[PDB]
Design an enzyme around this catalytic site. Structure first.
Site, PDB file in Angstrom:
ATOM      1  N   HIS A  56      33.759  67.780  -9.312  1.00  0.00           N
ATOM      2  CA  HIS A  56      34.432  66.911 -10.317  1.00  0.00           C
ATOM      3  C   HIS A  56      34.558  67.629 -11.622  1.00  0.00           C
ATOM      4  O   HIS A  56      34.546  67.000 -12.679  1.00  0.00           O
ATOM      5  CB  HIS A  56      33.672  65.636 -10.500  1.00  0.00           C
ATOM      6  CG  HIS A  56      33.831  64.696  -9.351  1.00  0.00           C
ATOM      7  ND1 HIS A  56      33.324  63.417  -9.354  1.00  0.00           N
ATOM      8  CD2 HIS A  56      34.446  64.855  -8.155  1.00  0.00           C
ATOM      9  CE1 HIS A  56      33.596  62.835  -8.208  1.00  0.00           C
ATOM     10  NE2 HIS A  56      34.295  63.670  -7.479  1.00  0.00           N
ATOM     11  N   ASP A  65      37.283  69.017  -2.779  1.00  0.00           N
ATOM     12  CA  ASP A  65      37.135  67.625  -2.809  1.00  0.00           C
ATOM     13  C   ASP A  65      38.471  66.958  -2.953  1.00  0.00           C
ATOM     14  O   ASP A  65      38.782  66.425  -3.992  1.00  0.00           O
ATOM     15  CB  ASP A  65      36.245  67.371  -4.023  1.00  0.00           C
ATOM     16  CG  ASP A  65      35.934  65.918  -4.227  1.00  0.00           C
ATOM     17  OD1 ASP A  65      36.151  65.107  -3.351  1.00  0.00           O
ATOM     18  OD2 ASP A  65      35.462  65.582  -5.312  1.00  0.00           O
ATOM     19  N   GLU A  98      40.005  57.688  -2.192  1.00  0.00           N
ATOM     20  CA  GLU A  98      38.545  57.787  -2.043  1.00  0.00           C
ATOM     21  C   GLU A  98      37.845  57.688  -3.419  1.00  0.00           C
ATOM     22  O   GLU A  98      36.840  56.974  -3.604  1.00  0.00           O
ATOM     23  CB  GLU A  98      38.173  59.100  -1.396  1.00  0.00           C
ATOM     24  CG  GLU A  98      36.724  59.259  -1.024  1.00  0.00           C
ATOM     25  CD  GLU A  98      35.871  59.921  -2.081  1.00  0.00           C
ATOM     26  OE1 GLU A  98      36.371  60.206  -3.168  1.00  0.00           O
ATOM     27  OE2 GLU A  98      34.674  60.153  -1.802  1.00  0.00           O
ATOM     28  N   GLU A  99      38.420  58.415  -4.387  1.00  0.00           N
ATOM     29  CA  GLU A  99      37.827  58.560  -5.682  1.00  0.00           C
ATOM     30  C   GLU A  99      37.970  57.345  -6.577  1.00  0.00           C
ATOM     31  O   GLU A  99      39.028  56.662  -6.585  1.00  0.00           O
ATOM     32  CB  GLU A  99      38.458  59.741  -6.393  1.00  0.00           C
ATOM     33  CG  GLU A  99      38.248  61.090  -5.589  1.00  0.00           C
ATOM     34  CD  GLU A  99      36.901  61.745  -5.829  1.00  0.00           C
ATOM     35  OE1 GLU A  99      35.962  61.070  -6.276  1.00  0.00           O
ATOM     36  OE2 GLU A  99      36.728  62.923  -5.463  1.00  0.00           O
ATOM     37  N   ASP A 119      33.921  66.424   3.714  1.00  0.00           N
ATOM     38  CA  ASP A 119      34.077  66.287   2.276  1.00  0.00           C
ATOM     39  C   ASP A 119      33.318  67.411   1.556  1.00  0.00           C
ATOM     40  O   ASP A 119      32.309  67.870   2.011  1.00  0.00           O
ATOM     41  CB  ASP A 119      33.603  64.901   1.818  1.00  0.00           C
ATOM     42  CG  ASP A 119      34.166  64.475   0.463  1.00  0.00           C
ATOM     43  OD1 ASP A 119      34.727  65.239  -0.296  1.00  0.00           O
ATOM     44  OD2 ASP A 119      33.947  63.280   0.100  1.00  0.00           O
TER      45      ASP A 119
HETATM   46  C1  LIG Z   1      22.085  61.763  -1.053  1.00  0.00           C
HETATM   47  O1  LIG Z   1      22.417  60.886  -2.155  1.00  0.00           O
HETATM   48  C2  LIG Z   1      23.397  61.072  -3.106  1.00  0.00           C
HETATM   49  C3  LIG Z   1      23.869  59.874  -3.557  1.00  0.00           C
HETATM   50  C4  LIG Z   1      24.835  59.859  -4.523  1.00  0.00           C
HETATM   51  C5  LIG Z   1      25.360  61.016  -5.037  1.00  0.00           C
HETATM   52  N1  LIG Z   1      26.297  60.764  -5.951  1.00  0.00           N
HETATM   53  C6  LIG Z   1      27.469  60.178  -5.646  1.00  0.00           C
HETATM   54  S1  LIG Z   1      28.513  59.868  -6.782  1.00  0.00           S
HETATM   55  N2  LIG Z   1      27.804  59.855  -4.404  1.00  0.00           N
HETATM   56  C7  LIG Z   1      29.181  59.529  -4.086  1.00  0.00           C
HETATM   57  C8  LIG Z   1      30.028  60.800  -3.960  1.00  0.00           C
HETATM   58  C9  LIG Z   1      31.446  60.372  -3.582  1.00  0.00           C
HETATM   59  N3  LIG Z   1      32.348  61.542  -3.554  1.00  0.00           N
HETATM   60  C10 LIG Z   1      32.612  62.395  -2.558  1.00  0.00           C
HETATM   61  C11 LIG Z   1      33.547  63.279  -3.048  1.00  0.00           C
HETATM   62  N4  LIG Z   1      33.859  62.901  -4.317  1.00  0.00           N
HETATM   63  C12 LIG Z   1      33.107  61.834  -4.594  1.00  0.00           C
HETATM   64  C13 LIG Z   1      24.923  62.289  -4.603  1.00  0.00           C
HETATM   65  C14 LIG Z   1      23.919  62.293  -3.601  1.00  0.00           C
HETATM   66  O2  LIG Z   1      23.361  63.436  -3.093  1.00  0.00           O
HETATM   67  C15 LIG Z   1      23.777  64.765  -3.290  1.00  0.00           C
HETATM   68 ZN   LIG Z   2      35.106  63.721  -5.591  1.00  0.00          ZN
END
Ligand SMILES: COc1ccc(NC(=S)NCCCn2ccnc2)cc1OC
Ligand SMILES: [Zn+2]
Ligand SMILES: *[C@@H]1O[C@H](CO)[C@@H](O[C@@H]2O[C@H](CO)[C@@H](O[C@@H]3O[C@H](CO)[C@@H](O)[C@H](O)[C@H]3NC(C)=O)[C@H](O)[C@H]2NC(C)=O)[C@H](O)[C@H]1NC(C)=O
Length: 322
Positions: A291, A125, A162-163, A209
């Site tokens: 994370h 990530d 991104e984060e 990702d």
């Molecule tokens: C399908 O719906 C989902 C919706 C939300 C999350 N949780 C988060 S925080 N989404 C943003 C992740 C951003 N990111 C990418 C890399 N580092 C951070 C998980 C999901 O399914 C597994």
């Molecule tokens: Zn992340």
């Protein structure tokens, strides 16, 4: 209208021999040593590692023969900690070409308070996704080089920021991609075009990702690009059948379509929002290590990354008719 071409664009399939070439032409261990490891550092925005990582990415691109034009989109944006600098990296082949297939990752790593000696380096990530893009550019260099001679080429974007800095939210995430999507929207393309911008030029944004864990599964999120998701499936399958993947059966295909995935926020959103077609290659479920400090080199699964390198590289060649 040329902007409409992405919608009808068809891939030019590789036969068994060209597939074997692609599988032979990527080296997971060279990616690991030369592309990935120098990114396995703390590189949240503004960190020393952010600069090292940005330089590394750009160095790796620039050393290639293809005529990558590298740009850094640097800007300040307010985060929960105040204004911070971010630099997206954009690497473009044939910047004049109206259309580009875009491959993207985010190269920042998530900030966590430095509470002990360890640092979060986000191996999946998204150091691996970035290293994969670099490996792709390198593996495919000779063919991509030949694009100098559809008005369609390739772009790589390494998003910074991104984060979230504090708690994921639309104000606190996607700083680099929000900024860049906005920038490409205010960037007419081709230059002196009236009504078309760089977003129009984005045929397809393939955003990688959370890659590098064993047994990822990539949902198909978007009706719009399902045919391209299908091409990944087909590629995984044919590569599998040609004995060109490693440690991987189709028992648990990487590309499993269990219906349109519920969208996961990520750097594609600011683009998707503008109607850019997206293929979001994020593993879902997220790696157990997501994370955490254990999102590190040790927990990466090389064969999986190597398979996906083959798959993606095929996808890209086929998209580009190379
Ligand atoms: C399908 O719906 C989902 C919706 C939300 C999350 N949780 C988060 S925080 N989404 C943003 C992740 C951003 N990111 C990418 C890399 N580092 C951070 C998980 C999901 O399914 C597994
Ligand atoms: Zn992340
Ligand atoms: C799988 O696809 C391969 C790649 O498309 C096939 O090999 C291709 O065969 C073409 C002719 O049959 C070649 O055309 C030549 O291109 C080269 C430059 O690459 C030129 O110098 C030549 O002038 C040109 N030939 C002529 C008569 O004009 C393709 O270049 C060639 N591609 C590659 C990458 O080698 C494979 O044969 C095919 N395999 C199977 C089993 O079908």
């Amino acid at each position: 209208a040329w902007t409409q071409e992405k919608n009808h664009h068809q891939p030019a399939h590789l036969n068994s021999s060209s597939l074997q070439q692609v599988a032979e032409g990527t080296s997971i261990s060279e990616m690991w040593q030369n592309d990935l490891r120098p990114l396995l550092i703390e590189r949240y925005p503004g960190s020393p590692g952010s600069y090292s990582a940005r330089q590394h990415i750009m160095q790796r691109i620039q050393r290639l023969q293809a005529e990558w034009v590298v740009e850094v989109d640097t800007f300040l944006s307010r985060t929960p900690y105040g204004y911070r600098s971010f630099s997206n990296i954009i690497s473009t082949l044939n910047p004049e070409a109206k259309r580009h297939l875009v491959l993207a990752c985010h190269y920042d790593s998530k900030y966590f308070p430095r509470w002990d000696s360890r640092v979060f380096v986000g191996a999946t990530d998204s150091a691996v996704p970035c290293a994969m893009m670099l490996e792709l550019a390198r593996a495919l260099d000779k063919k991509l080089h030949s694009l100098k001679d559809p008005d369609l080429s390739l772009q790589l974007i390494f998003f910074d920021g991104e984060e979230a800095f504090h708690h994921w939210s639309p104000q606190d995430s996607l700083y680099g991609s929000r900024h860049l999507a906005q920038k490409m929207a205010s960037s007419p393309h081709p230059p002196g075009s009236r009504g078309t911008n760089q977003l129009d030029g984005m045929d397809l944004l393939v955003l990688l990702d959370l890659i590098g864990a064993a047994n990822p599964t990539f949902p198909n999120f978007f009706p719009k690009t399902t045919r391209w998701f299908n091409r990944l499936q087909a590629i995984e399958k044919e590569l599998y059948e040609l004995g060109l993947l490693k440690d991987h059966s189709l028992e648990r295909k990487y590309f499993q379509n269990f219906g349109y995935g519920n969208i996961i926020q990520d750097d594609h959103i600011p683009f998707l929002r503008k109607g850019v077609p997206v293929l979001h290659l994020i593993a879902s479920p997220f790696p157990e290590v997501w994370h955490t400090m254990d999102d590190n080199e040790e927990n990466l699964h090389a064969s999986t990354i190597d398979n996906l390198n083959k798959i993606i590289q095929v996808f890209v060649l086929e998209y580009l008719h190379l």
